[PDB]
Amino acid sequence: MSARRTESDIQGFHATPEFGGNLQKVLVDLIELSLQGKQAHWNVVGSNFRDLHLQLDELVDFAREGSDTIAERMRALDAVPDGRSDTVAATTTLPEFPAFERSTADVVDLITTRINATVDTIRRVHDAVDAEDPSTADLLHGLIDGLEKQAWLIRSENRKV
Amino acid sequence: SARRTESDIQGFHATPEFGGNLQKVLVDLIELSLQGKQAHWNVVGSNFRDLHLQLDELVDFAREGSDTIAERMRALDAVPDGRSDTVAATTTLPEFPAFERSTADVVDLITTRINATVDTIRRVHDAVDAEDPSTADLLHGLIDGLEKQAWLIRSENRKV
Amino acid sequence: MSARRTESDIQGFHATPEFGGNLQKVLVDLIELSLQGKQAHWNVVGSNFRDLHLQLDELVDFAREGSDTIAERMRALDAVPDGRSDTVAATTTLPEFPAFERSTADVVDLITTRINATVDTIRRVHDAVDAEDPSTADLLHGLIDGLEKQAWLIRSENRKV
Amino acid sequence: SARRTESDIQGFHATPEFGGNLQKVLVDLIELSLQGKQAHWNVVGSNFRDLHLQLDELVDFAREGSDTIAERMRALDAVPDGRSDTVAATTTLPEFPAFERSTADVVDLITTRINATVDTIRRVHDAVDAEDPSTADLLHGLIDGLEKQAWLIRSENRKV
Amino acid sequence: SARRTESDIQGFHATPEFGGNLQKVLVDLIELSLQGKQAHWNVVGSNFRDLHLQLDELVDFAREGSDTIAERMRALDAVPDGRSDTVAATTTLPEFPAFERSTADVVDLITTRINATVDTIRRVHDAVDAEDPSTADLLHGLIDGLEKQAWLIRSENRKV
Amino acid sequence: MSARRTESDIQGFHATPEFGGNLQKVLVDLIELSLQGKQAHWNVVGSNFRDLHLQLDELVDFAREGSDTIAERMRALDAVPDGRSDTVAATTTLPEFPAFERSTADVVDLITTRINATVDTIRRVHDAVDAEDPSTADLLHGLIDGLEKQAWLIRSENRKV
Amino acid sequence: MSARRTESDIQGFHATPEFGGNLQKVLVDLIELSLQGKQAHWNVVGSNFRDLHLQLDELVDFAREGSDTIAERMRALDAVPDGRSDTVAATTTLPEFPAFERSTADVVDLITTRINATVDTIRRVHDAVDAEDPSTADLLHGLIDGLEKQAWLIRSENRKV
Amino acid sequence: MSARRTESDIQGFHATPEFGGNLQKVLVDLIELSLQGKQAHWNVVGSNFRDLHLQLDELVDFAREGSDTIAERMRALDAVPDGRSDTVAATTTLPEFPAFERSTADVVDLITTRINATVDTIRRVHDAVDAEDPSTADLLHGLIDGLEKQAWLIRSENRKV
Amino acid sequence: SARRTESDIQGFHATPEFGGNLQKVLVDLIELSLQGKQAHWNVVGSNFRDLHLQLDELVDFAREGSDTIAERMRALDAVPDGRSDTVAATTTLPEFPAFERSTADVVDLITTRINATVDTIRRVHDAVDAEDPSTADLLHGLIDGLEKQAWLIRSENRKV
Amino acid sequence: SARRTESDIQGFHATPEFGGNLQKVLVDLIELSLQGKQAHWNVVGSNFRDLHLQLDELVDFAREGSDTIAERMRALDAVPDGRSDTVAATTTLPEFPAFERSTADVVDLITTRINATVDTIRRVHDAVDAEDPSTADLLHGLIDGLEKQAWLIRSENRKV
Amino acid sequence: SARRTESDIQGFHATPEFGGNLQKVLVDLIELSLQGKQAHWNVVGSNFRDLHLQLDELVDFAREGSDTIAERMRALDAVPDGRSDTVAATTTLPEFPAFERSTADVVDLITTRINATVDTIRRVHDAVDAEDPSTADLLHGLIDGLEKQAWLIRSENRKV
Amino acid sequence: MSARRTESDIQGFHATPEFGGNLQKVLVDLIELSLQGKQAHWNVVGSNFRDLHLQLDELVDFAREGSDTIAERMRALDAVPDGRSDTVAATTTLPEFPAFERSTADVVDLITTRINATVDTIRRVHDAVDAEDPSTADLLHGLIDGLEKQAWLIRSENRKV
Ligand SMILES: [Cl-]
Ligand SMILES: [Cl-]
Ligand SMILES: [Cl-]
Ligand SMILES: [Cl-]
Ligand SMILES: [Fe+2]
Ligand SMILES: [Fe+2]
Ligand SMILES: [Fe+2]
Ligand SMILES: [Fe+2]
Ligand SMILES: [Fe+2]
Ligand SMILES: [Fe+2]
Ligand SMILES: [Fe+2]
Ligand SMILES: [Fe+2]
Ligand SMILES: [Fe+2]
Ligand SMILES: [Fe+2]
Ligand SMILES: [Fe+2]
Ligand SMILES: [Fe+3]
Ligand SMILES: [Fe+3]
Ligand SMILES: [Fe+3]
Ligand SMILES: [Fe+3]
Ligand SMILES: [Fe+3]
Ligand SMILES: [Fe+3]
Ligand SMILES: [Fe+3]
Ligand SMILES: [Fe+3]
Ligand SMILES: [Fe+3]
Ligand SMILES: [Fe+3]
Ligand SMILES: [Fe+3]
Ligand SMILES: [Fe+3]
Ligand SMILES: [Mg+2]
Ligand SMILES: [Mg+2]
Ligand SMILES: [Mg+2]
Ligand SMILES: [Mg+2]
Structure with a gap:
């Protein structure tokens, strides 16, 4: 038992209220993005429908995994997520x-904007999150990387060169 | 030759009432999935792990359910609205x-909300079936699956 | 503004005693079919042994999945299944x-008859089940379809010209 | 004690009218698969790849469907006919x-072919349902899957 | 050159006593599977889900086991009897x-049923081993797997 | 320094009308075989039903993959396939x-004959195809090999002693 | 404090020459069975061809896995297997x-006899193997079990009533 | 060869002795945690046994993958891990x-404490590791994230709200 | 005994001309794969996703193709050179x-470069086949696969 | 009815000697797995990769082995102790x-330690078999698997 | 209308000379597999594991090959002979x-055995190709796969 | 719409020319390494050929996934990769x-050097990349970690201790 600690209760790392708040901001925008992505997935019509229909589902898959990651990271750090519809609608920045039905061209522009809004939230909280807990900042990096890839894959459709 | 002569054969299109009925089912499925995730994250206490896991299975089912209904709407020329404001303003759940909730409270809460969701589907069933029996089969799958989830969740709180 | 219900306790659909009894009838015949299917699977000998041996196991798989579906549907609707050996033996209609051993030809006829009997139970209770709960009748349709397919795949061995 | 004592119990036999109704569904499903492949090979132009791929998914669904219908016929002791001459002579499509056809033309052509196939299933539905509800459920699956394919394909040409 | 020259070489035949010993194992394995499913459906209360799931794993194991024993009988030209009437009439369980049973009661009931099944296998073991060591190895697998299931289930009720 | 070609438009290999027609002949017989294979699969009854039922589906799978290979090879080489029901019926050599129902023994003979006919078409066009395009003849070799294997697996049911 | 052994060289279990010879006897019969199994698999014709064709391949798979198990057990115990064609032919007891071609009925009888012979070798060496090394006898039990199951699945074709 | 380096030997990044020491600290606590997790996995009894039994194995899986990651990162950076039982026992901080058997309630508290001790070690060395090699700090972030998730999933069992 | 008596049986070795012919195929396959990735990353505009995806499938095929050829060279005692300087200095593409390129331009560009690659293989085919028919079969697989890729890509730009 | 009448049928419980014998096997398997990982990480030199890989396979086997034994102890009401202090203080290896060790030295070292582990299992075998043949079968699997590992590892260092 | 009207159309029959040519390939492929396993078991020394593993991949390939050849014979109504006595009596290997053989010796021995097997296939190639080009393609696959195995194995002994 | 932004176009994060240049440097060295790895994979001969042959392919797999990651990260950030053969040859630092054929000993030393050169490039640009975009630095950490592991797995072959 040469280096063994002799403490009965060893407590875990607890997020500050500011940290908890910062993750909550990321959470609602990820959920909103998932809900908007599905709306777009269902209602997109027109030229290159199928590619967009499929890409939007991949976006939704990523945003849903992201929301679960963020929410469970909150739980791990003794913070409490709120992903309820009312909260998401009242607090999202998207x-x-x-x-109604929207053209593929419209959907590309709309969804690129909403992805960029979501990324902006993550980028806005990043430094404060990193200063308190670098391990959580790494989860944010995954989200930034994954979402900015989605934006590129979606927006390239409307690019005229 | 029994070949039809039309160049533009149109498909079955739903009445506004029918589309509105599927919209009702849609918002309650979306709401259930959001509440399911809330519960999944925030449940604590005795038998946490089982409940945490079962709630994700509920969410999986409700999400595929919402997609099925919304895409059935699209197939029949109806237009779904699954947006957060719409779901919040129109859900019956x-x-x-x-905040954190005990496993016992989560069992009771989620069972009530599953039953509310099943109730919506049961309420619209006959009107849906009368217009389009094929869509009613999709509703049957939902009723069956969700009522199975209600049983799997509620049994935790049963006395003898 | 809000369509939210306000009851703290919302009850689920509860099956009538008659409905429960009808599903119980289906249950015992499915279990009996599973048990007879295995008996036939082990004890068939003769011309085209292997095919029947294999097909019988597919029948047993379907009947077992069937019994679990019915029993769990009962549970979902606040009914209580009885799949115990004594009950199955005492109440099966098969x-x-x-x-002992039976020839391939005999097993074909025997098992086809027992599938037909199992399906007849489902068809006999169908209308009463459908009237109370259309969603349960749909599960019955899956059973009827899957079992009548098994009957075709098994019986065709003995059908001539 | 509740055991039935007859040595041979007969199964459910389809009437010949029922058989003929399923035969109508079968030939149109087969025709659709053959047309689906024709389109899959010969489609050219803007958004080729999506159409090429979606057409194969349609064919997969129609082929599974024709198998389902033909085997249901056999289960009920009806006898299917999926031979080329019969399909050509009796299809309603x-x-x-x-030759090569543009993606826009293929979209419209195939949507029409799917809609014709669904129309056949919807036309025989009530007579099939009256004799055998379990078979009508298979028809519901086909209606649901084909109308989904119609939506997925036609959306390409939808201007809003 | 070392080749045997007889046209038909006979395989190992089980004695009827050996066959009867395996028959004893078979009926108890089948009874256990049927009881396992009964419990799986009807268990309610604290830690429902874990029990519901563990009971299915027990049933899976007992079903594989009964197949293993019945097929070993057939391999040695014994003839199994797994019919409902026989199982009910001859099981030692x-x-x-x-009706519904609490998780605590199900734990104790099923542990007893598993222990009875293992007892049967242990009781016939030496007579089976004396005639055919290869069959005794299958019995060892069953003893090992069932006693593991007994530990996994009963641990729920263990107070320390 | 550089071996780079400088043309901005380099054309692909274009099949002759004769080559296209030869592949079209293969195509219709493969599709016809697929359709007959399914017919046999549904309608076979009698001794050893299941084996033939199963093997016929493997034949249909191979013939379907075959027809797609041939049709796509046509497309690759700027030829245009015709797999429509009317064309298949009007031009198949099978x-x-x-x-209606046919016995296992009859189905064995019938289907073996139709595979033999399909293979004969491929063998008849082989040398003309090989002369123009050796890479396409290789696809023909795969078809010949796979179909003659099917013929063996099916016909052996009826071969005595 | 410590129960650690202090030898720098600890030797493994070494099989006697007799033990090695006993496993060699098992080995050659398993390889011979594999070779005969394939011969039968290719050359069987007649009623229920496909079932026997398929089952024979499962037998060959088991016998091949068996021969590798035995040969590797020999290697583990410092014995040296001989699976060469000349040795197998010169020393097999099968x-x-x-x-040439053989009927389904003949192949059933022939192969059943050869499995019985293979199992008899394993049963003949069993007690001597078990006495020296119980762990190896357990591998023999797996072989006996798996092969006698194959014999049942194959022979039952010819068993009447 | 315009930007090509012309060096025969290009050496890799080598960890300082302090860095090597810091990773060694993380390594022993991960190994100790794996060993304690398995002990708990085997010996846990009482209410909600199965969930805990299963979760503890997931913990062990994660801690084992972690130890291999850390040890191989050491190897990559020319450091030498010591994961031997004596070293682990003598130097762990857990x-x-x-x-003996421990109740599920006891095991939850015990294991949460030991996970938290392991996380504390990683958190303690983090800044020094990050200052020398940010790529290794990212591996630590994975460990922190994964372990704190395990702690939350385990400790939630004992939470009274 | 028909057993051969030699202790050192040597394998088939390729002529320098043969090795040089496979080297020609190799550099064009490597170049195609590098250009394929360039296009995959830099394509923008109408139907971006389909083209992005198809180009990766092209790259996959060309990379396995290059490995096949290089390893066939090794099998026959030839020595491949797939180094960047060699590929750049000796590719015929x-x-x-x-920079960014439109989907329409990418379709035309990549089709030309696939055709250039197929041309190399077709140019060396007869000399390869004359020496070693087994290697010509590998060439046939390449011609078939790449010409399929050309068709799948170019069809996007087709008029009617 | 052959049904047993007892409400509380108990399972087989191991003697203290038996539990102690399985404990002996357990600590040596755990020690082997820890040494296996040490070797896996620290081996260098000729044929590093093969040895690195084989050692992980050894570790995999020893870890599943330790779990099997510890859980067999639990099934029979024995209590395993796999803690680091216990393993260090009681292992016979x-x-x-x-530090870094050459592949040749690692081969010799690990072979010795595998043989030490097999020796423990062989030493306790007869006493285990006498009490519970089913547990001896688990021991046979261990002996077989580890002796296979010894062969696969040691063959690297063999002379002719 | 283009339908042939004969009731039985005969398939392609191999001449007995063709059959005998494939028989030559078959026995050498079988011999190679048996020798491959012998080597796989008995190889010892430096880089044991790589050889042990590569030899199994060779055996896998040769076994698939012998099946391919024997079944091609059957497809063309030739009759294979893969019996031990025939293989020993007629193999050219x-x-x-x-006994145990060093890795270096096994490398050289097996390379020779592979080369002998390939030589047989190359020797019969032109006669097989003349009668049936489709069979020659199977021979090409075998030549390609075996020569790859020869390269993968012999490279171990190559000094540069 | 309480926190909702009301902007029509929300733009994404755009990489500076310096950042774009820095990723381009990493890209060419990853591509060069993939091409060199394959060259080594094909042409390596001698003692322990197979292990090296196999390891080199794993290296190539990793370097190829890396190049795609870097290139697509550039695209996501509105930068434009150049992975063309001429560019790679003219600008690589490897x-x-x-x-020709090279001995396994030679290949080990050669490839270790080239991996180390690639890692050096990533390490050289790291701080500038991290200062502008921490999410991209995390992708670099994956590359550093993965490549340094490959170097250790390859170089250990030549280590004499
Ligand atoms: Cl679980
Ligand atoms: Cl089968
Ligand atoms: Cl796609
Ligand atoms: Cl390997
Ligand atoms: Fe960082
Ligand atoms: Fe209905
Ligand atoms: Fe229905
Ligand atoms: Fe349904
Ligand atoms: Fe060819
Ligand atoms: Fe080929
Ligand atoms: Fe044993
Ligand atoms: Fe065993
Ligand atoms: Fe990361
Ligand atoms: Fe050729
Ligand atoms: Fe024993
Ligand atoms: Fe989750
Ligand atoms: Fe969807
Ligand atoms: Fe269940
Ligand atoms: Fe079918
Ligand atoms: Fe079975
Ligand atoms: Fe296709
Ligand atoms: Fe082996
Ligand atoms: Fe490792
Ligand atoms: Fe390769
Ligand atoms: Fe375990
Ligand atoms: Fe075969
Ligand atoms: Fe990519
Ligand atoms: Mg598209
Ligand atoms: Mg639980
Ligand atoms: Mg059969
Ligand atoms: Mg090696």
């Missing part, structure tokens, strides 16, 4: 997705 | 509470 | 499978 | 044109 | 009770 | 499959 | 498989 | 796991 | 341009 | 050295 | 030596 | 791989 511009509202429009109703 | 009792609001799930914020 | 003719007893004979003892 | 408009003929697919020869 | 205490009857499983009807 | 004897018509008879209607 | 009756020779006859040449 | 409180000793108690002997 | 027109250089792929830098 | 010669200590594996620290 | 030099006998594999008894 | 010493040229020699022609």
